[PDB]
Amino acid sequence: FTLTLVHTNDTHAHLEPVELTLSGEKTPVGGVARRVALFDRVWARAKNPLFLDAGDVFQGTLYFNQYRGLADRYFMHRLRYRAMALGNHEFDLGPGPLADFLKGARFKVVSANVDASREPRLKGLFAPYAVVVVGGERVGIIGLTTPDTREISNPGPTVAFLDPYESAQKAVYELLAKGVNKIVVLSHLGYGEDLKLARRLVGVQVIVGGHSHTLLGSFPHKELSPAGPYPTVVKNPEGKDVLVVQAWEWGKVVGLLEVTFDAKGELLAYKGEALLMTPEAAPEDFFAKEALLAYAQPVMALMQQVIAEAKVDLVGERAVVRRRESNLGNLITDGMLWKTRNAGTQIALQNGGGIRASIPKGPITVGKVYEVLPFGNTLVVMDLKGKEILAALENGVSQWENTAGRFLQVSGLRYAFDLSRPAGSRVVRVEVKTEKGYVPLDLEATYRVVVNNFIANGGDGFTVLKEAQGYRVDTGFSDAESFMDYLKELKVVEAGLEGRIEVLNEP
């Protein structure tokens, strides 16, 4: 039996194509219109195609701010997706909007480790796994959601997360008991976690994932540098091959993995490729393009409103903003201090996971600002003891190896951390910027800082900020609006590296 798995992950409301320089020339990459054309051809040509999405459809552009995933859902229906795993961002607005998205979803939404027993709004709207019939054969699809969702999203008090391994292996047994031996895990745990899980589970031949926004495969463009091969192969406890795949992010890539199974559901052969969604891959479907224009109507003005000009590229790539100093991170934090200068703020902290895109040199539109800061978090002014600021910085670099979003970009201070040291004691130096130059952080002194409400409330593992007993006031200042006010003030934006963060003994 031959099955052709066609998949996407972390589309993050990026329905329009983006622009990248490929082989020495600005090229449009991604877009649902182009995906519709490609999928239509795969649907009528490929052998037993099965379309899947690994989660994180939610959060990323004005299309989400305006439709909360419903615009994406319309396209997912047109794209014939058969199953979708719940990602952490599907919980960003709590159970309410998630239920609205699931109510009417004509594809199977799965996650074996999401315990929603305490949430009536999600009853029967998703399942641990699904059984889909393809070419006369049954294929089981087990979903998994990163347990980190508890800290990185807003699932709320009615949703809990279970161990991926225990949940998945149980699902494998249930499927086998039903006579389904061809099983695929649709995971939102991360590439690294998928590789580890693949060495533990038995009965699973393929793991289609996301969460880490990992680019796998090979491309004819020197500008791209994949993190691994497509697919990546590991051995399970029984010495059998397990294929792990991912398709980068924002619909910029579509994965196509053709797997052949025997009667027992064992892997006989496999071939795959990560398809970069450029004009060469396929044209844009006419009607899908028109449909997107329909959705764009209420937010079109914002997408065209230029509020400033970037004289240099403002770097927002996750491998940068979540691991080292970023000039965009410096700009945003500078803006936070600027907006709250009337409050006497001296330091600004911003988690890199909250900076979602780069701003290439050129015009800066309102639409672009919301792609960079999509959450709608507000600025919170609070007094922190030096010890608390230090603890915050430590939490920020505590998961550097996993490129976690808690990493802190800063303004008003500089810090250096040693990666050869254990998590919790990596920050070796912290100095506050003053008129008389840099002064070592005083762990016993109090400093007025500005952060966003998500981390101020304890999100991203910032329990130290949630537990702070000092002065605390939510300004009500929107993050995006505040950043735009700063950009409008500057008019012509320039931002470079200022040695605010020093990475020592980096692997």
Ligand SMILES: Cc1cn([C@H]2C[C@H](O)[C@@H](CO)O2)c(=O)[nH]c1=O
């Ligand atoms: C839900 C939410 C996530 N985030 C960031 C922090 C996490 O590291 C990351 C998880 O995707 O997104 C915010 O900054 N604000 C929010 O409101």
Ligand SMILES: [Zn+2]
């Ligand atoms: Zn994501």
Ligand SMILES: [Zn+2]
């Ligand atoms: Zn994710």
